[PDB]
């Protein structure tokens, strides 16, 4: 079905040459041309979701997009695609939505044609084998199992199900093993014949959106892929749409009271509204979302803060199905924010009434049009994975010149649209849902799949009538015009000082200043990552708590000014570390010094409100013991970083230490912390040397002006060490989770500090153990959905870790982990030298890649300056060293460090029990670990790194 | 001349040594000491003779005779034969010369009574006085006067002796120099010897001898052993030279002195001459005055003098003189501005005297001091075998043989009329003033005769006199309150089922930890308590460390005035700091340590700061800090060694610079932060019970919680500091330049290992095998220096070997010859026989092995084990049981891998100290960056 149409595309700063076309069998085609990109890519998206499933089997398309991986007629072997993208550094993945399932992958250079050959003919011949089926049912059951107690998916499906039960919206989306194979076989239904029915009828027809990120040309990739795509055959499946919202007045004006697992409190407001997807030029939803969820002077959130009932909120237009859509408002609750909800809804309707009074505005439309004009014009670059899938996601709705100016450019103002959407948002149409823990013994109607409990009580007409008649204005105002808007678009010419790496241009006992100028990207932006260092941060539980609440109330105060800048494209973040305080400004080159001056001057002389401190205190006290509820792989990684640092306060002691946090204690603490400190900063981007010197001087002078900061002495620039293992030990201990009925494990291996050799030894071993572990443990042995192999580097020491979540006894799992190590040990000799080359080159191109976004190279340089390495050219160093490796070297790595007959064995695992609870070699008895401090008592400590 | 008069002597029952006093017919006072348990014997001779007896033209003749009288008897006319007999048998002799005594004493190894007595009796028969004794003892006198040139005691005493009546024998010189002995006599041709035989025959032989024998034989053998060889002393009936008049005969009253010193010292000297109260030993008013003047308590004189900030300390009381007269002295400290307010000071002493003249004498005070000194005599502890004999031979002359033990430690009666008499004696007509100050340059013409210091008469004028007498009133001065408490309980407590020989852990909580041991061996009414307060904030940064320092220092300065009167009752304490926390010691009796410890905790909980006190402590520590440029460079080397090989260490430079910011509000904020949350640890040892020990600790920590709401620490923050691991090959060094001393120190450190049970005894035996031959070869033969030391190092649970040598040398020459000494000892290893081996390991054994002798010893050793968190209570016995199972090759193999020059395990590191004129170490922080850290020790 070879038909071709293309022309000039309005593509903004970008250099990627473009064309688009569409094949006569209903296939959208995008041609991307770029001669400077390493990794080429492509990504197919089928415009069919899981709301188009058959009425008997739930999560059938979910299981199909899993099952479309394995097996074609041209290459019927199982992992062939995946192994071919493990050979040439590719990484495919897929996800599922209500109406879309979207395949995507990556490749290096010319290897795209080989990758596409496996990828394209999945559609002709899918196989659906014994083992594929019988293992994917376990992978789907684990996919549902991690989402059982996750409160986001819980409330998602509970909203999905309490609508129209006649609408397909009510039907389940993922499906556990019970609906996938237990439900059909007790009905006699063959799984495979539905898969073939579904692939033939729905999938094969239309509505594909392919893209091709290629580095060849335009014309040659064109006449490659047009020839290569004529085998997809049109079937004329009509566009599946829904002509009505799921709330046909049986389910309107209704409340719900939901009991969560984690102690959270949230309030959910929903409006069903007709579709404005045809109105993507004017897009009233951006105007409504801009005005409602704004955070400025006279905003609604400012009022909710001023009464202290709501911490933060977000609202706006929520996307839904093709036919209908939603409009949400989601706020946080405090104690009497939980008790005085009705007044919160009254204030939302008063702000809506303020919008009902003034109506639409035009200077807002001009302001947002200029902001999206600039912001779309100066876009940096794109990820070769994810960009192509995103554009192919939005290619469905737009003509061939609007594929790029998709929604990031808006032409016209249609205020009649704003009166209509204003007329929908009324108290007749509101749905309310309260999430609170205290609703125990009171909720009878149980969820069918997950098991949460809720109750609907029709709102008493008195509250409804009071909502409609009482719509007036109190103290809510329209948001003042922004001033955080740039006029700085002038590219600064690089100086005679043409260094390619940031140099230490200023050294004191107070600070350290590193500086470059952007030779490549030529954008008017710069980065600033000041990092504060202080002794008193981690001295005790008490002072660490004081640090977290200090920086928390700091951001809570300086948020209300900061919101307009962050909305304008000037972002910041104050955070705390074990070392000190962390500052990161990023954005345009307009008001860099102005915002930075204000932030630093504000956090210099800072004050505390009483009930504000009480709310932040209570809330973080509740957030501490919430750390019981996470997945046990995270819980295990938390215990690993507990044992492998020098000092570490656990969450129990940190929780208990808030028993003494009084407000005068904080107000005494603050200037003692701020008294003396050290600053080390990375400055990167479109500025000059002298302006960088002025910004740094500015900073330290502001500090000396406020709190009279004096420099530190260089003997308390300490870092934390990491615990030595006794050269032969295999250590382990266990915890027990309360909520989840699953066990986790993490299997640590201490090699050595980062010397130039050890990095490339461990990287090559890591890549040769990456893909076969996914092939045999999760896929072939079906150990668990969460499998994570690879290298962990902490405190300047290299390590190897394996993360396995399943529902098993963990010692069986240890035994089969070691069995996988023996299997790899034998497979090492089997690997050919040519296969080794198809691995060391993938390590070179995996390691070597030039940054695309400026934030990437700045984050990399920063990530190396905070580690005191400063070796900015380790990439060239490591790659040049990397070519001088052999295979017998990796046995010399395997034997003494990793094997079981190892004299230098440095092994340690962590068990995490569940709520309730082919061969293995001779593993010795383990030790029990009662006191983690008494563990670390007699053990040596590692050195730190020699600075380059 | 065998005459005997004695009987049973009353001794407080704890003592068991049996005594007998008698006196021989030739005028010899005899006491008999029988202790069959003493290792070393000694002997003593007391002559009641004075420099006043020596002829008016030549001073100190008897001093030069009693020097020259040592060598040569008729039974042993050889020169050194006495001295050689005491050099063989470990003996050591030493005598002094006073205004009314010359008192010979000596000792001997075990049994040499007969021997030494053959070398001791014919001093009375035959003194020789030959050419050589004369010509050597004149050099001995010249060296005694030359070293007593700069001795300030003798200088001020002679200046008090000589500025009275210049005819009175009080103005004589006690020792006598070379001028009177051989400069004026030989130019006048006068024979010293004939005057020496005159003096010896007429004066010494007559009477009033005080022979005494520290023996271990029996009560009689030594008795008729010395009475046999003491009959050649023949009575002469020389009358007792006494003075019936004071030497300050109104010519020198109401007088000042202005003294020019060599050393930068400052002192103020008030002197009162007073009559004889020696017959009145019943009340002893002179020590009563020393009690009431030098008291430091509520309403005391020095209490207000401190409150005015002029005077650190004082001392006063009765000063003995000749038989006839006695003295009464007051010795006070001076500040800078104390030199301007002299008359004010003297007015305050008079004011005090007047307060005592107003409310008068006291009787219950005398009874209290009587009961406390009754207890202090009842429960004596011990006595040194040397020095004791010369003392008790000193008072044998003045007291009957029954009063020789209840000597002054008992007071019969109260004499308020006498106290009125001496209260009438402390008046400004009587005062004698002397002032010490360096600032008296060009102003004092009147030079001292012997030493050559310069002074001034400078009588106090009369307006200053008259203001003292008629204008006399009281301010803030009050007599002291009674502190009887309870002294009635001295009963011993019987041992219970808990018969441990080592302290048992009777309580463990997360707040404290309590170890306990009732006294089995001593059965003495004494108790010891030790306390550690652990807290993280001590050594976090130089500012916090300074705040902790100043806190405990000024805490002591606050509590001293209240506590000192309790310290007079027999309960001593000490507060100091650690790098970890604070150190509290409470030592004394069992009766009232609970009330004292209660008030100590109640006091240091609620604590305040004074301004000028804070300023004085601040300035004082600023001096103590910037002094550290000026100490001995071997100490400099030990300080830098403890800097480099610990985890964190703040040098004195940062502590010096950071003190600019220590203000009062900052400390007053810091104190409750420190005291908020902490850990306790305690050793309890003495005659006590388990329940009262548990109850006192409970009560104590409850009071601690009562004040500042004490909460326990978290058991993950009881960390300790580790020690730096050398890289298995390193020989590291760097240098430090002294500023003041033109001398170069050096310390040669060697890392072996952690304390395993073998390594302690490896290092002790190897240390001892290089101990005595290093003493033989280094200073004598190699002539390295005078301050040379070697041996172990115990720090952070890690052993070590070191060589501290300070000299004025190039430091690398000294390292090279130190390595030559290691090679010399290395080959000196392989030539060792069995005999040297066995005496050496037995030497180590008896060096280590000893039973204890007092509760402070065992309590200090057990505390020394709990502070290191080792807890190995019987390492003594285990290490000794291990020690005999070693060979020569065990220490050869111990030596080679760690210590040799071609060693794989050679852990060597040095510190160079230069005079004012491997790898290098640029930054000590960048040094400690990349070296690993050792583990700690598992507690048993």
UniProtKB/Swiss-Prot annotation, chain A:
- Report a single Gene Ontology molecular function: metalloendopeptidase activity
User: EC number(s) in its UniProt entry?
Assistant: 3.4.24.56
Q: Gene3D superfamilies given for it?
A: Metalloenzyme, LuxS/M16 peptidase-like (3.30.830.10)
As annotated in Swiss-Prot or TrEMBL, what is the tissue specificity of this protein? Detected in brain and in cerebrospinal fluid (at protein level).
The main enzyme category here is hydrolase
Catalysed reaction(s) here are: Degradation of insulin, glucagon and other polypeptides. No action on proteins
Pfam families, per the entry: Peptidase_M16, Peptidase_M16_C, Peptidase_M16_M, PqqF-like_C_4
Q: How is it modified after translation?
A: The N-terminus is blocked.
Necessary cofactors: Zn(2+)
Q: Where is the signal peptide?
A: none
Show the InterPro entries listed in the entry. Metalloenz_LuxS/M16, Pept_M16_N, Pept_M16_Zn_BS, Peptidase_M16, Peptidase_M16_C, Peptidase_M16_M, PqqF-like_C_4
Q: Where is the active site?
A: 65
Q: Quote the cofactor binding remark.
A: Binds 1 zinc ion per subunit.
Q: What is the effect of changing residue 65 to Q?
A: Loss of catalytic activity
Chain positions found as N6-succinyllysine: 146, 651
Q: Per its Swiss-Prot or TrEMBL record, what regulates the activity?
A: Activated by small peptides. Activated by ATP and GTP, and to a lesser extent by CTP, TTP and PPPi. Inhibited by bacitracin. In vitro modification of Cys residues impairs enzyme activity.
> What PROSITE patterns is this protein classified in?
INSULINASE
In which family does this protein belong, per the annotation?
Belongs to the peptidase M16 family.
Q: What is this protein called?
A: Insulin-degrading enzyme
From the UniProt record, report the name of the gene that encodes this protein: IDE
């Amino acid at each position: 079905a070879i038909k071709r149409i293309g022309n000039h595309i309005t593509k903004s700063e970008d250099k990627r040459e473009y064309r688009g076309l569409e094949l006569a069998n209903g296939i959208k085609v995008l041609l991307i041309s770029d001669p400077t990109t390493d990794k080429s890519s492509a990504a197919l998206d089928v415009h069919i979701g899981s709301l188009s499933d058959p009425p008997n089997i739930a999560g059938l398309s979910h299981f199909l997009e899993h099952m479309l991986f394995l097996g074609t007629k041209k290459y019927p072997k199982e992992n062939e695609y995946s192994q071919f993208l493990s050979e040439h550094a590719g990484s495919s993945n897929a996800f599922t939505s209500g109406e879309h399932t979207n395949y995507y992958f990556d490749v290096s250079h010319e290897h795209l044609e080989g990758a596409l050959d496996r990828f394209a003919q999945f559609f002709l011949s899918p196989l659906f084998d014994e083992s594929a089926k019988d293992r994917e049912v376990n992978a789907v059951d684990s996919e549902h199992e991690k989402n059982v107690m996750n409160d986001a998916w819980r409330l998602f499906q509970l909203e999905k199900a309490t609508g129209n039960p006649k609408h397909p919206f009510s039907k389940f989306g993922t499906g556990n093993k019970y609906t996938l194979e237990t439900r059909p076989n007790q009905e006699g239904i063959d799984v495979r014949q539905e898969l073939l029915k579904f692939h033939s009828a729905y999938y094969s027809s239309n509505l594909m959106a392919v893209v091709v990120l290629g580095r060849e040309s335009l014309d040659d990739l064109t006449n490659l892929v047009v020839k290569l795509f004529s085998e997809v055959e049109n079937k004329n499946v009509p566009l599946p749409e829904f002509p009505e919202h799921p709330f046909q007045e049986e389910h309107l004006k209704q409340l719900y009271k939901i009991v969560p697992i984690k102690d959270i409190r949230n309030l959910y407001v929903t409006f069903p509204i007709p579709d404005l997807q045809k109105y993507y030029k004017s897009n009233p939803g951006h105007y409504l979302g801009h005005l409602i969820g704004h955070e400025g002077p006279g905003s609604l959130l400012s009022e909710l803060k001023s009464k202290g009932w709501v911490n933060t909120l977000v609202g706006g237009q929520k996307e839904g199905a093709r036919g209908f859509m939603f409009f949400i408002i989601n706020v946080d609750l405090t104690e009497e924010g939980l008790l005085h909800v009705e007044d919160i809804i009254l204030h939302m309707f008063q702000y809506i009434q303020k919008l009902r009074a003034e109506g639409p505005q035009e200077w807002v439309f001009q302001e947002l049009k200029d902001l999206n004009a600039v912001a779309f014009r100066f876009k940096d670059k794109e990820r070769p994975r994810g960009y192509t899938s995103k554009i192919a996601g939005i290619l469905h709705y737009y003509p061939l010149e609007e594929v790029l100016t998709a929604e990031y450019l808006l032409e016209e103002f249609r205020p009649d649209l704003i009166e209509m959407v204003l007329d929908k948002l009324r108290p007749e149409n509101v749905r309310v849902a309260i999430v609170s823990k205290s609703f125990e013994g009171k909720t009878d109607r149980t969820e069918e799949w997950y098991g949460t409990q809720y109750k609907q009580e029709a709102i008493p007409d008195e509250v409804i009538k009071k909502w409609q008649n009482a719509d007036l204005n109190g103290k809510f105002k329209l948001p003042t015009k922004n001033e955080f808007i740039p006029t700085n678009f002038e590219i600064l010419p690089l100086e005679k000082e043409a260094t390619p790496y940031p140099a230490l241009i200023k050294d004191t006992a107070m600070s350290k200043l590193w500086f470059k100028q952007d030779d490549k990207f030529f954008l008017p932006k710069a980065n600033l990552n000041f990092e504060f260092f202080s002794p008193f941060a981690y001295v005790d539980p008490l002072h660490s708590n004081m640090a977290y609440l200090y920086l928390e109330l700091l951001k809570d105060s300086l948020n209300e000014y900061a919101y307009a800048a962050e909305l304008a494209g000037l972002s910041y973040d104050l955070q705390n570390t074990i070392y000190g305080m962390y500052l990161s400004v990023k954005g345009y080159n307009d008001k860099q010094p102005i915002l930075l001056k204000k932030i630093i001057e504000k956090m210099a002389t800072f004050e505390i409100d009483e009930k504000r401190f009480e709310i932040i205190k209570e809330a973080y006290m509740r957030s501490l013991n919430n750390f019981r509820a996470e997945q046990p792989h995270q819980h295990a990684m938390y215990y690993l970083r507990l044992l492998m640092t020098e000092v570490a306060w656990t969450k129990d002691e940190l929780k208990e230490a808030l028993d003494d946090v009084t407000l005068p204690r904080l107000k005494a603490f603050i200037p003692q912390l701020l008294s003396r400190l050290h600053i080390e900063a990375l400055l990167h981007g479109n500025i000059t040397k002298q302006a960088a010197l002025g910004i740094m001087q500015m900073v330290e002078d502001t500090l000396i002006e406020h709190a009279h900061t004096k420099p530190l002495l260089p003997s308390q620039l300490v870092r934390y060490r990491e615990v030595q293992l006794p050269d032969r030990g295999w250590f382990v201990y266990q915890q027990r989770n309360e909520v989840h009925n699953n066990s986790g494990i993490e299997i640590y291996y201490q090699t050595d500090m980062q010397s130039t050799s050890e990095n490339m030894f461990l990287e090559l071993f890591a890549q040769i153990i990456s893909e076969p572990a996914f092939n045999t443990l999760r896929t072939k042995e079906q150990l668990g959905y969460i499998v994570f192999s690879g290298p962990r580097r902490a405190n300047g020491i290299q390590g190897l870790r394996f993360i396995i979540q399943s529902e098993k006894p963990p010692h069986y799992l240890e035994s089969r982990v070691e069995a996988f190590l023996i299997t790899m040990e034998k497979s090492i000799e089997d690997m050919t030298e040519e296969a080794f080359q198809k691995h060391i080159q993938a390590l070179a191109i995996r390691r070597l890649d030039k940054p695309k976004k400026l934030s990437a190279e700045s984050a990399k340089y920063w990530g190396e300056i905070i580690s005191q390495q400063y070796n900015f050219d380790r990439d060239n160093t490591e790659v040049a060293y990397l070519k001088t490796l052999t295979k017998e070297d990796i046995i010399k790595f395997y034997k003494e460090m990793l094997a079981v007959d190892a004299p230098r064995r440095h092994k340690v695992s962590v068990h995490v029990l569940a709520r309730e609870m082919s061969q293995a070699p001779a593993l010795p008895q383990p030790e029990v670990i009662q006191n983690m401090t008494e563990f670390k008592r007699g053990l040596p400590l590692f050195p730190l790194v020699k600075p380059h």
